[PDB]
């Protein structure tokens, strides 16, 4: 990992535990990446001191691409998950089975993390804000709208979210819920060879159109668009510097 009124306009000021809260990418190549997210999403940028490149679509902070630490790497898409208090939710991930990849610690005053994997080895941060609270839009076009914990063992995954961060979930595909808000889904991944990770999708108008549009700026159309029966439609991408994820297009 890197660090080592029911119309109203989806803006977040607070993330409830359980919640996935943020998404950032580490690359091989920042200003390459910058270009490309721009031209998918119209992101604009703020560098903050290497550098941590703030995204920014009219006016809010809705992701962030940041460099690769020492060691080699494929570039990824990271997921965090919104806690209250850090280190007692670290206190429970060996006891649930899982992993503390990266031990908690105070990232400048922006909040705390730690990185940590569940027992299927799906890698997850826990973030405590401070300064930092997460995306503060959400949900429209050129932002994050769905975190999907694709793994082989969901109900073991899940038991394990439930036990360290108190998120529970129902089927219909599992959908998971922080109280009573669903913050994500879950399912099994769609091909084998696809380690088991929490995948991101960003909402975007017209997945075909992205999607044509990804592959012209250098990245990769890795699951051509196609339906999700009373969702809506989606495409699976890469970058050109190799990072994958998805659109959606909600109906
Ligand atoms: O519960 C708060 C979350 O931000 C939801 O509004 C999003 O839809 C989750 O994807
Ligand atoms: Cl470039
Ligand atoms: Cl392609």
Known sequence: ????????????????????????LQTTDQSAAKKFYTSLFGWGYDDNPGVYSMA?????????????????????????????????????????????????????????????????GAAVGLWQANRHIGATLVNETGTLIWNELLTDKPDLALAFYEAVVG???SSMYRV?????????????????????????????????????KAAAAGGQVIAEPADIPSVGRFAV?????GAIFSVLKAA
């Open 1 to 24: 990992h890197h660090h080592s009124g029911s119309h109203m306009m989806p803006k977040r000021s607070e993330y409830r535990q359980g919640t996935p809260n943020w998404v950032d």
């Open 56 to 120: 920014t679509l009219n006016g809010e902070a809705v992701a962030a691409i940041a460099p690769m630490p020492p060691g080699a790497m494929p570039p990824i898409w990271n997921t965090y998950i919104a806690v209250d208090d850090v280190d007692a939710v670290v206190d429970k991930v060996v006891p649930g089975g899982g992993q503390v990849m990266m031990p908690a610690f105070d990232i400048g005053d922006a909040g705390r993390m730690s990185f940590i994997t569940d027992p299927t």
């Open 167 to 169: 998120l529970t979930h």
């Open 176 to 212: 998971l819920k922080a109280g009573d808000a669903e913050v994500g889904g879950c399912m099994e991944p769609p091909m084998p060879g696809v380690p088991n990770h929490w995948h991101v999708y960003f909402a975007v108008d017209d997945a075909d159109a992205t999607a044509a």
């Open 237 to 241: 991408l890469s970058d050109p510097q």
